[PDB]
Structure 1
Amino acid sequence: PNFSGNWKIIRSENFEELLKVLGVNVMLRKIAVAAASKQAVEIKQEGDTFYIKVSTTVYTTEINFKVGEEFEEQTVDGRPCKSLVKWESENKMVCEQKLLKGEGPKTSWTKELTNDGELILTMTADDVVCTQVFVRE
């Protein structure tokens, strides 16, 4: 459907706790939390092909995938991973990730388009879930 658009963040909850699980030290966590409040997301959706660009003040990353097809990206803490996105309903997808090297917490993310017009992103490390809410620019 209509994930396509330019999204700007309005809320970010439990991000510090997520980074803590992933081993990030406290000063860097606080700085990452501040960076997260400037997060912008650009999405182009065509059928089940997605192009996603996530940026902050000094960094930008692009994600390209097709639902049901494995691709490579990086975890929240920056480790390379194999990813696979599946639909959970009309406007929610869930991505499971697997580390390319070594071991770590089990990570994943979801994106959901609500009926209120919000884009909800969740990111998970084991027990800890970060939720971020976006609205259209």
Structure 2
Amino acid sequence: PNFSGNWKIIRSENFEELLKVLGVNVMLRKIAVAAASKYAVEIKQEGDTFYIKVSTTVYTTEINFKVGEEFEEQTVDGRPCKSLVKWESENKMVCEQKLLKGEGPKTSWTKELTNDGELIETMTADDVVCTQVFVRE
């Protein structure tokens, strides 16, 4: 479908609770929550190949992958992982991650296009699910 677009966050839920699972201390969590209110996602999708640029006010990175082929990225708290994206439905993809070194919570993310034109991203650490909602800019 059409994940392609420039997406601006309109809602962020449970992000602090996710970072807490990930071991981030309280005051860095609060500043990161503030940073998540400026979270923007730029997506270019060509077939099952995705170019995704995620950014806040002072930081930007790119995540490029093809559905079904392993790649390397980082968890949201910054630890390197191996990742594999698969479709779950026409408009939703799920990414499973595996830490490259050491241990830690089981992390994953998802992206979904709703039939209202919203992008819904979730991020998971063990038990805790962060949900962020975007609209096209």
Fold equivalence (TM over 0.5) = yes
CA distance in 2, matches of 1:2, 1:21: 33
2:117 partner SS = coil
Query: Structure 1, residues 63-97: CA drift from partner, whole Å, max 9, x if none?
Result: 00000000000001100000000000000000000
Cα deviation digits, residues 13-60 of structure 1 (max 9, x gap):
000000000000000000000000000000000000000000000000
Q: When the two structures are aligned, how many residues end up with a matched partner?
A: 137
Mapped to 1, the partners of 2:119 and 2:6 lie a distance apart of 10
Identity of aligned residues (%): 99
Q: Which residue in 1 is equivalent to 2:31?
A: 31
Q: TM-score, normalised by structure 1?
A: 1.00
**2:133 alignment counterpart:** 133
Question: Which residue does 2:81 correspond to in 1?
Answer: 81
Partner SS for 2:32:
helix
How far apart are residue 102 of structure 1 and its match? 0.4
**Secondary structure, aligned partner of 1:81:** strand
State the secondary structure of the residue aligned to 1:11.
strand
CA RMSD of aligned residues (A): 0.3
1:9 positional shift: 0.1
* Alpha-carbon offset, residue 124 of structure 1: 0.0
Q: After the TM superposition, list the runs of 4 or more consecutive aligned residues in structure 1 that deviate by more than 3 angstroms.
A: none
Question: 2:107 maps to what in 1?
Answer: 107
Question: Distance between the aligned counterparts of 1:49 and 1:75, measured in 2?
Answer: 20
CA displacement, residues 78-136 of structure 1 (integer Å, 9 cap, x when unaligned): 00000000000000000000000000000000000000000000000000000000000
List alignment gaps of at least 5 residues for structure 2: none
